[PDB]
Scaffold this active site. Sequence first.
Site, PDB file in Angstrom:
ATOM      1  N   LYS A  18       0.809  -1.313  -0.016  1.00  0.00           N
ATOM      2  CA  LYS A  18       0.163  -0.172   0.184  1.00  0.00           C
ATOM      3  C   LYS A  18       1.032   1.314  -0.015  1.00  0.00           C
ATOM      4  O   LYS A  18       0.465   2.166  -0.952  1.00  0.00           O
ATOM      5  CB  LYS A  18      -0.737  -0.075   1.298  1.00  0.00           C
ATOM      6  N   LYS A  37      11.468  -3.546   2.840  1.00  0.00           N
ATOM      7  CA  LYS A  37      10.075  -3.100   2.559  1.00  0.00           C
ATOM      8  C   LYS A  37      10.361  -1.759   2.589  1.00  0.00           C
ATOM      9  O   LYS A  37      10.837  -0.896   3.445  1.00  0.00           O
ATOM     10  CB  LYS A  37       9.254  -3.494   3.625  1.00  0.00           C
ATOM     11  N   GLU A  86      13.361 -10.494   7.237  1.00  0.00           N
ATOM     12  CA  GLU A  86      13.769 -11.728   6.854  1.00  0.00           C
ATOM     13  C   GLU A  86      13.189 -12.109   5.459  1.00  0.00           C
ATOM     14  O   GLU A  86      11.796 -11.675   5.538  1.00  0.00           O
ATOM     15  CB  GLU A  86      13.271 -12.734   8.118  1.00  0.00           C
ATOM     16  N   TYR A  87      13.870 -12.647   4.529  1.00  0.00           N
ATOM     17  CA  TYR A  87      13.352 -13.032   2.963  1.00  0.00           C
ATOM     18  C   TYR A  87      12.475 -14.525   3.401  1.00  0.00           C
ATOM     19  O   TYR A  87      13.018 -15.342   4.039  1.00  0.00           O
ATOM     20  CB  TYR A  87      14.458 -13.075   2.145  1.00  0.00           C
ATOM     21  N   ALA A  88      11.441 -14.414   2.786  1.00  0.00           N
ATOM     22  CA  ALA A  88      10.564 -15.588   2.755  1.00  0.00           C
ATOM     23  C   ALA A  88      10.361 -16.076   1.174  1.00  0.00           C
ATOM     24  O   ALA A  88      10.044 -15.548   0.421  1.00  0.00           O
ATOM     25  CB  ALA A  88       9.154 -15.290   3.094  1.00  0.00           C
ATOM     26  N   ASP A 131      -4.475  -8.281  10.752  1.00  0.00           N
ATOM     27  CA  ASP A 131      -4.648  -8.227   9.477  1.00  0.00           C
ATOM     28  C   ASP A 131      -3.943  -9.587   8.745  1.00  0.00           C
ATOM     29  O   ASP A 131      -3.100  -9.779   7.811  1.00  0.00           O
ATOM     30  CB  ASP A 131      -3.660  -7.055   8.643  1.00  0.00           C
ATOM     31  N   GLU A 135      -2.317 -12.636   1.734  1.00  0.00           N
ATOM     32  CA  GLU A 135      -1.020 -11.992   1.031  1.00  0.00           C
ATOM     33  C   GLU A 135      -0.319 -11.626   2.288  1.00  0.00           C
ATOM     34  O   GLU A 135       1.117 -11.159   1.851  1.00  0.00           O
ATOM     35  CB  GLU A 135      -1.787 -10.749   0.185  1.00  0.00           C
ATOM     36  N   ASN A 136      -0.524 -11.858   3.460  1.00  0.00           N
ATOM     37  CA  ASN A 136       0.383 -11.506   4.585  1.00  0.00           C
ATOM     38  C   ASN A 136       1.043 -12.827   5.304  1.00  0.00           C
ATOM     39  O   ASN A 136       1.713 -12.500   6.127  1.00  0.00           O
ATOM     40  CB  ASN A 136      -0.328 -10.424   5.546  1.00  0.00           C
ATOM     41  N   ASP A 149       3.619  -8.685   7.887  1.00  0.00           N
ATOM     42  CA  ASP A 149       2.976  -7.401   7.882  1.00  0.00           C
ATOM     43  C   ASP A 149       2.376  -7.005   9.083  1.00  0.00           C
ATOM     44  O   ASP A 149       1.145  -7.260   9.133  1.00  0.00           O
ATOM     45  CB  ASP A 149       2.044  -7.621   6.511  1.00  0.00           C
TER      46      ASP A 149
HETATM   47  N1  LIG Z   1       9.885 -10.729   3.293  1.00  0.00           N
HETATM   48  C1  LIG Z   1       9.419 -11.001   2.527  1.00  0.00           C
HETATM   49  N2  LIG Z   1       9.776 -11.906   1.724  1.00  0.00           N
HETATM   50  C2  LIG Z   1       9.035 -12.156   0.662  1.00  0.00           C
HETATM   51  N3  LIG Z   1       8.237 -11.407  -0.134  1.00  0.00           N
HETATM   52  C3  LIG Z   1       7.708 -10.668   0.778  1.00  0.00           C
HETATM   53  C4  LIG Z   1       8.269 -10.185   2.138  1.00  0.00           C
HETATM   54  N4  LIG Z   1       7.519  -9.072   2.531  1.00  0.00           N
HETATM   55  C5  LIG Z   1       6.569  -8.866   1.938  1.00  0.00           C
HETATM   56  N5  LIG Z   1       6.678  -9.489   0.529  1.00  0.00           N
HETATM   57  C6  LIG Z   1       5.660  -9.387  -0.388  1.00  0.00           C
HETATM   58  O1  LIG Z   1       5.307  -8.063  -0.641  1.00  0.00           O
HETATM   59  C7  LIG Z   1       4.100  -7.835  -0.198  1.00  0.00           C
HETATM   60  C8  LIG Z   1       3.727  -6.602   0.380  1.00  0.00           C
HETATM   61  O2  LIG Z   1       4.364  -6.771   1.785  1.00  0.00           O
HETATM   62  P1  LIG Z   1       3.655  -6.152   3.080  1.00  0.00           P
HETATM   63  O3  LIG Z   1       4.708  -6.183   4.320  1.00  0.00           O
HETATM   64  O4  LIG Z   1       2.337  -6.898   3.310  1.00  0.00           O
HETATM   65  O5  LIG Z   1       3.068  -4.786   2.872  1.00  0.00           O
HETATM   66  P2  LIG Z   1       1.874  -3.926   3.123  1.00  0.00           P
HETATM   67  O6  LIG Z   1       1.892  -3.297   4.422  1.00  0.00           O
HETATM   68  O7  LIG Z   1       2.104  -2.672   2.143  1.00  0.00           O
HETATM   69  O8  LIG Z   1       0.771  -4.898   2.692  1.00  0.00           O
HETATM   70  C9  LIG Z   1       3.429  -9.035   0.650  1.00  0.00           C
HETATM   71  O9  LIG Z   1       1.902  -9.393   0.215  1.00  0.00           O
HETATM   72  C10 LIG Z   1       4.435 -10.204  -0.325  1.00  0.00           C
HETATM   73  O10 LIG Z   1       3.801 -10.482  -1.673  1.00  0.00           O
HETATM   74  O1  LIG Z   2       2.766   0.008   4.791  1.00  0.00           O
HETATM   75  C1  LIG Z   2       2.777  -0.606   6.101  1.00  0.00           C
HETATM   76  O2  LIG Z   2       3.685  -0.927   6.437  1.00  0.00           O
HETATM   77  C2  LIG Z   2       1.792   0.107   7.195  1.00  0.00           C
HETATM   78  C3  LIG Z   2       2.175   1.867   7.610  1.00  0.00           C
HETATM   79  C4  LIG Z   2       1.348   2.075   8.712  1.00  0.00           C
HETATM   80  C5  LIG Z   2      -0.280   2.051   8.326  1.00  0.00           C
HETATM   81  C6  LIG Z   2      -0.434   0.762   7.924  1.00  0.00           C
HETATM   82  C7  LIG Z   2       0.414   0.023   6.910  1.00  0.00           C
HETATM   83  C8  LIG Z   2      -0.086  -1.138   6.018  1.00  0.00           C
HETATM   84  O3  LIG Z   2       0.822  -2.271   6.327  1.00  0.00           O
HETATM   85  O4  LIG Z   2      -1.031  -1.379   5.677  1.00  0.00           O
HETATM   86 MG   LIG Z   3       0.543  -3.976   5.839  1.00  0.00          MG
HETATM   87 MG   LIG Z   4       0.266  -6.807   3.489  1.00  0.00          MG
END
Ligand SMILES: Nc1ncnc2c1ncn2[C@@H]1O[C@H](COP(=O)(O)OP(=O)(O)O)[C@@H](O)[C@H]1O
Ligand SMILES: O=C(O)[C@H]1CCCC[C@@H]1C(=O)O
Ligand SMILES: [Mg+2]
Ligand SMILES: [Mg+2]
EC number: 2.7.11.1
Length: 264
Positions: A18, A37, A86-88, A131, A135-136, A149
């Site tokens: 986002k 991130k 940490e990388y997944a 949450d 996707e998380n 996340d």
């Molecule tokens: N550590 C990670 N390893 C692999 N893919 C990741 C990792 N963190 C995030 N991603 C990918 O990036 C996307 C967005 O990361 P996320 O932390 O959920 O961001 P947001 O807070 O914007 O939702 C995840 O849904 C996944 O597809």
């Molecule tokens: O992008 C982020 O990691 C976060 C920042 C704070 C608001 C919520 C947001 C999210 O995970 O949706």
């Molecule tokens: Mg998030």
């Molecule tokens: Mg997310």
Amino acid sequence: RQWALEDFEIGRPLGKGKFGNVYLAREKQSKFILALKVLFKAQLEKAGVEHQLRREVEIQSHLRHPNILRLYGYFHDATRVYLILEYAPLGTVYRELQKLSKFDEQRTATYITELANALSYCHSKRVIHRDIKPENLLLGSAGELKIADFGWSVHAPSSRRTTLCGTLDYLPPEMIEGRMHDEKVDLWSLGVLCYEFLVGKPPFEANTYQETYKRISRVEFTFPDFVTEGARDLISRLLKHNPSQRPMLREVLEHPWITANSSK
Ligand SMILES: Nc1ncnc2c1ncn2[C@@H]1O[C@H](COP(=O)(O)OP(=O)(O)O)[C@@H](O)[C@H]1O
Ligand SMILES: O=C(O)[C@H]1CCCC[C@@H]1C(=O)O
Ligand SMILES: [Mg+2]
Ligand SMILES: [Mg+2]
Ligand SMILES: N#Cc1cc(-c2cc(C(=O)O)cc3[nH]ccc23)ccc1Cl
Ligand SMILES: [Cl-]
Ligand SMILES: [Cl-]
Ligand SMILES: [Cl-]
Ligand SMILES: [Cl-]
Ligand SMILES: [Cl-]
Ligand SMILES: [Cl-]
Ligand SMILES: [Mg+2]
């Protein structure tokens, strides 16, 4: 100690978020593979979510569990904030579900067990994720589920409102209603995930936001015929309007359907 962007070589994008993007990265000296991130300060500031970012960082930093994604550090430059994660390597459960369409009972019970273990650890510290959605949920090198996340995570109890126009599919009635909520919100999301894993779609899915809201608030869902008695029983216990009527995580882990189908 204190990282900067120059300490890493950036690779391909791992996923879109986002408030920016997540990239594969390599620390230059160690050659250690991690995920960065990236968040845009201007976007975080316009939305007023700095307080929630501070919680993501403070909560995730202190958690240590094999089914919870580690947050190693963070830094920032003039325009961006960088979370060192940490990388997944096996991607998201979201992607796995798009590929397979639906999961068998063994894969579902194993993921539910890993999720229940991770949440049991969070809840032991009164940390609520709020949450929990495919996707998380990331996958480690052994295909093990890792909760990621912590963007919306808080200490229980809370009445904070998370998304305003984002998906409601994983949220319990007390959260969509703006009521006081606790650990039981993650139990409801666990029930939504168990259903979606077996069926291929979340239980309250609808064309509009208002119709999804209505379905969630009345707990309106039905099972397709292939869902077994044991899975129906566990899902029906998790998807209770009254949060106090939702089972404890130990009851989920000991559920006969979970023990019969879990990989262990
Ligand atoms: N550590 C990670 N390893 C692999 N893919 C990741 C990792 N963190 C995030 N991603 C990918 O990036 C996307 C967005 O990361 P996320 O932390 O959920 O961001 P947001 O807070 O914007 O939702 C995840 O849904 C996944 O597809
Ligand atoms: O992008 C982020 O990691 C976060 C920042 C704070 C608001 C919520 C947001 C999210 O995970 O949706
Ligand atoms: Mg998030
Ligand atoms: Mg997310
Ligand atoms: N490292 C780091 C970090 C930096 C900010 C931040 C700092 C500034 C600043 O110091 O000027 C400005 C900002 N605007 C949006 C976020 C933000 C917030 C959280 C973290 Cl983890
Ligand atoms: Cl705000
Ligand atoms: Cl593919
Ligand atoms: Cl908090
Ligand atoms: Cl109706
Ligand atoms: Cl109602
Ligand atoms: Cl039937
Ligand atoms: Mg779907």
